[PDB]
Every structure is written in C-alpha cells, then in structure tokens.
Amino acid sequence: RQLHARVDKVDEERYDIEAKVTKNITEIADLTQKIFDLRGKFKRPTLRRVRISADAM
Amino acid sequence: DEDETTALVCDNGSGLVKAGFAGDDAPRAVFPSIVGRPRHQGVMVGMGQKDSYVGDEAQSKRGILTLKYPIEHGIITNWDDMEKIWHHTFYNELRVAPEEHPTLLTEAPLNPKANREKMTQIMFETFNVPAMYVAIQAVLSLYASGRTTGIVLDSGDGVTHNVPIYEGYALPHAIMRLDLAGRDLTDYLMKILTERGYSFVTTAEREIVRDIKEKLCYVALDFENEMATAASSSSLEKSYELPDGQVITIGNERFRCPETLFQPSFIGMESAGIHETTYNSIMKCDIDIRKDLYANNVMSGGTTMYPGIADRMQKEITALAPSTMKIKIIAPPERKYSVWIGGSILASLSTFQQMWITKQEYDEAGPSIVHRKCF
Amino acid sequence: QNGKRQTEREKKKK
Structure with missing residues (x-):
C-alpha cells in the first residue's frame, strides 16, 4: 500500500521535474535564435562572392 | 541563489518599482512601472x-x-502589463523565481480592493508563489523609521494617504486621505514650463519633466518671500540639460509647481493641502493620542526629497498645533525608500510568519483571500 | 408581482 502511495507521488513530482527541464530547453532555443539574429546583424554586410569579375572582364 | 527561501519584496508604485529580497538593506534593482x-x-x-x-x-x-503606467494613483488597472513588469523584475534583473520564495507587495489602506486582489492573483497564478502578503505603506514606513506611533505622511507619485498609527494600530477615522500627488506636480510642471517656451506634451517630454522636477524643484520654507525674489531676479534660476542639447532654465516655477502640495488650488484641486491634512490626522485622534502623534510626524514617500519639505511640514503643523507642547518631524535619509525597507523588515519578522497567505489557503479561497488574511 | 495552474494540474494528473 505504501508503494502505491509512493508511485502516485513520484509521477506527480516527475511531471513537474520534466516540465522544468522543458522550460529551460525552451529558453535555450529562444536565446539561441536571438543570438543568431544578432550574428546576422554583423555578418550580413560581407556575405557575398565579391571582386572576381571586376578584373576578369 | 539564496541560502534560504527569503521573501521577495516588490514596492510597486505609480512611479518606480523597487525590488530585492527580504533581509537585505536595499532593492537589487529599480524599474519604472512602465x-x-x-x-x-x-x-x-x-x-x-x-x-x-x-x-x-x-x-x-x-x-x-x-x-x-499600469498603476494610477496607487492602483493597478492593467494587470497584463504588471505581469510583464514582474516577470522582468524577477527573472531578468533580480534573477529569481517567486515559485520558491514568498512575495510581499505594498498599498495604501484605502486603496480600492481590486488592487490587492489582483496583485494576489497575479503572484499566485502566473508566478505560482508559495505565499503572499500585501502590506500597508504606513506600517512599512514605521518599521523603517524605528516607530510604532506617528503620522505617516506618504505624499508619493500616486496618492497622499496620511494615516495616524498609535502603538502599531490604525486610527482609521482620522485618515486624512487626499487625491493630490507627485504625478500632479509633474503635470503642473509640464504646463508651467510650456508657458516659458518649452512645451512638454508627449511621452518623451513627460519623462524629461519628471527628471527636471526631481533635480531642480523645491518647496522652500516661505513661499511668498521665495517668490518675491524668484519672480524679481534671475539669481534664483537653475538650468537643466535636455537629451538633445537644449537648455531650460526655471525661475519661480521651480517652486510654484511643488507648492501645490501646500496650495492645491494651483491645479484646480479642492484641498487644504498636505500640512493641514497632516494636522487633522493628529487632531482627529483621541486627546491622549494627539500628544504622541504631535511628537512623531513621520515623513515618507515621494516629494519628501524636495528642499524645504521636512522643515516646512514641521513649521506648518506646529503653527496649527497648541502652544507649550513640542511638535516634531521625523524625516530620515530613508524617506521614500522606507516602504521597501519596511517590506524587508516585515517579511523577515518571526511574528509575521503567521500573516503570510500560503498557496494552499489560496486555492480553497481564491485571490479574495487577501481580504481575509492581510488587513 | 411576477486558470493556467488548472491546466498544468490536469496535465500532470492525466
């Protein structure tokens, strides 16, 4: 009987622990995209294949 | 991040929110309630x-x-924006999770009921705080100031509450509440400066005027003599730098705005002013109470940082008070930062552990529990 | 004269 009470309690707690992990994963995914947008902010001005045809032609 | 489940303290007004944890000396961060x-x-x-x-x-x-501003005259009218302010307060700058800490919020005793009820609901439902308490601003000021007896004159951005307290008890029949506050003084300063050729009507302009007020304005000890000179000579003008490089100088307007606290008619308000209401809070209490309240005029809240205000408030009430008796003002460098300080003190008292509402009682009663458990 | 918590509570229990 104690084990039934224990398994019932552990899954209630387990749900909350899994939810907490999920919340931190979600924050990483969101933070990661903000960083990627900031990366594009500074990399963008040079993302070209440049100054080749200028002499070839 | 703490070694105890210390309560979080958030002094959420109509101006700035001061927040940190109970047991400390000062808030960790301050935020405009915007x-x-x-x-x-x-x-x-x-x-x-x-x-x-x-x-x-x-x-x-x-x-x-x-x-x-989600808070007007001390009351939250927009709780979706307060959820955002609290999210920011707790997770971005204090970097704490209320889920693991009790939270203490503050309000005036006659603040309409929806304020404490919605504050209780947001913290229990969006932050899932284990416990709550909504505290009285006067109580918090009295703990911060070292008193159990006195008049708490709290003239901040929202409302002036002005409640007499004796031996830690309310004397509610003598609360000389007044709908006159620092926000009205700011509005008055925007208008009076507009008259000087510097219009202030937009949001950016309003924030600038509030900054001007805080650094340049004063109430003085004698208005008529101060204006006789300020209105006659440039020697009392003070300059201020605006963000775009403009320079504004303010003359008698520098004190005529703030003076509205003593002369409310300047903005169309029908009121005796903060010093007469302070006097009446003492006078309306029993005769064996009056002597202790006269000796303990407790200054707190905003506007308490105007030059001449502590000296003037004692002068104005001692002038109405009877002779022989000594009338005194308490106005420590902890003025206005007394509500937050009191929150830290109160949250941490062992006797206050019987006042906190838990996230147990909350579920059975709902947020209306705040009216059964706080005050 | 003639709640966000209820949702989470249900998720963990279900």
Whole structure:
C-alpha cells in the first residue's frame, strides 16, 4: 500500500521535474535564435562572392 | 541563489518599482512601472524591435514609444502589463523565481480592493508563489523609521494617504486621505514650463519633466518671500540639460509647481493641502493620542526629497498645533525608500510568519483571500 | 408581482 502511495507521488513530482527541464530547453532555443539574429546583424554586410569579375572582364 | 527561501519584496508604485529580497538593506534593482509600445511603422527589416518594452527597456527606447503606467494613483488597472513588469523584475534583473520564495507587495489602506486582489492573483497564478502578503505603506514606513506611533505622511507619485498609527494600530477615522500627488506636480510642471517656451506634451517630454522636477524643484520654507525674489531676479534660476542639447532654465516655477502640495488650488484641486491634512490626522485622534502623534510626524514617500519639505511640514503643523507642547518631524535619509525597507523588515519578522497567505489557503479561497488574511 | 495552474494540474494528473 505504501508503494502505491509512493508511485502516485513520484509521477506527480516527475511531471513537474520534466516540465522544468522543458522550460529551460525552451529558453535555450529562444536565446539561441536571438543570438543568431544578432550574428546576422554583423555578418550580413560581407556575405557575398565579391571582386572576381571586376578584373576578369 | 539564496541560502534560504527569503521573501521577495516588490514596492510597486505609480512611479518606480523597487525590488530585492527580504533581509537585505536595499532593492537589487529599480524599474519604472512602465510598459512601452512603438508609435511608428518599422522601415528596416531584421532590426529586432519588440512589440512591447518593459521597465528600463521602455524608458531606454522611449524615443519612439508611447509609455504607459499600469498603476494610477496607487492602483493597478492593467494587470497584463504588471505581469510583464514582474516577470522582468524577477527573472531578468533580480534573477529569481517567486515559485520558491514568498512575495510581499505594498498599498495604501484605502486603496480600492481590486488592487490587492489582483496583485494576489497575479503572484499566485502566473508566478505560482508559495505565499503572499500585501502590506500597508504606513506600517512599512514605521518599521523603517524605528516607530510604532506617528503620522505617516506618504505624499508619493500616486496618492497622499496620511494615516495616524498609535502603538502599531490604525486610527482609521482620522485618515486624512487626499487625491493630490507627485504625478500632479509633474503635470503642473509640464504646463508651467510650456508657458516659458518649452512645451512638454508627449511621452518623451513627460519623462524629461519628471527628471527636471526631481533635480531642480523645491518647496522652500516661505513661499511668498521665495517668490518675491524668484519672480524679481534671475539669481534664483537653475538650468537643466535636455537629451538633445537644449537648455531650460526655471525661475519661480521651480517652486510654484511643488507648492501645490501646500496650495492645491494651483491645479484646480479642492484641498487644504498636505500640512493641514497632516494636522487633522493628529487632531482627529483621541486627546491622549494627539500628544504622541504631535511628537512623531513621520515623513515618507515621494516629494519628501524636495528642499524645504521636512522643515516646512514641521513649521506648518506646529503653527496649527497648541502652544507649550513640542511638535516634531521625523524625516530620515530613508524617506521614500522606507516602504521597501519596511517590506524587508516585515517579511523577515518571526511574528509575521503567521500573516503570510500560503498557496494552499489560496486555492480553497481564491485571490479574495487577501481580504481575509492581510488587513 | 411576477486558470493556467488548472491546466498544468490536469496535465500532470492525466
């Protein structure tokens, strides 16, 4: 009987622990995209294949 | 991050929110009670840019934002914006999770009931705080000031509450509450400066005037003599630098605005002023109470940092008070920062552990529990 | 004269 009470309690707690992990994963995914947008902010001005045809032609 | 489940303390007013944890000396961070929103169409793409900004973000990016305060005259009218302010307060700058800490919030004793009820609901439902308490501003000021008896005259941004307390008990029949506050003084200063050729009608302009007020304005000890000189000579003008390089000087307007606290008629208000209401809070208490309240006029809240205000408040009430008796004002460098300080003290008292509402009782009663458990 | 918590509570229990 104690084990039934224990398994019932552990899954209630387990749900909350899994939810907490999920919340931190979600924050990483969101933070990661903000960083990627900031990366594009500074990399963008040079993302070209440049100054080749200028002499070839 | 703490070694105890210390309560979080958040002094949420109509001005700035001061927040930190119980047991400390000072808030960890302060935030304008503001949620900002762009009033312009975006032109460049991939610029980030939020739909809404919170606290200091809203103020820092204010050049193109309209800024709204969720709290007016001490009451939350917009709780969605307060959820954002608290999210920011707790997770971005204090970097704590209320889920693991009790939270203490503050209000005036006659603040309409919806304020404490919605504050209780937000913390129990969006932050899932284990416990709550909504505290009295006067109580918090009295703990911070070292008193159990006195008049707490709290003239801040929202309302002036002015409640007499004796031996730690309310004397509610003598609360000389007044709908006159620091926000009205700011509005008056925007208008009086407009008259000098410096119009202040937009959000950016309003934030600038509040900054001007805080650094340049005063009430003085004698208005008529102060104006006789200020209105006659440039020697009493003081300059201020605006963000775009403009320079504004203010003459008698520098004190005529703030003077509205003593002369409310300047903004169309029907009132005796804060010093007469302070006097009446003492006078309306029993005769064996009056002597202790006269000796303990407790100054707190905003506007308490105007030059001449502590000296003037004692002068104005001692002038109405009877002779022989000594009338005194208490106005420590902890003025206005007394409500937050009191929150830290109160949250931490062992006797206050019987006052906190838990996230147990809350579920059975709902947020209305605040009216059964706090005060 | 003639709640966000209820949702989470249900998720963990279900």
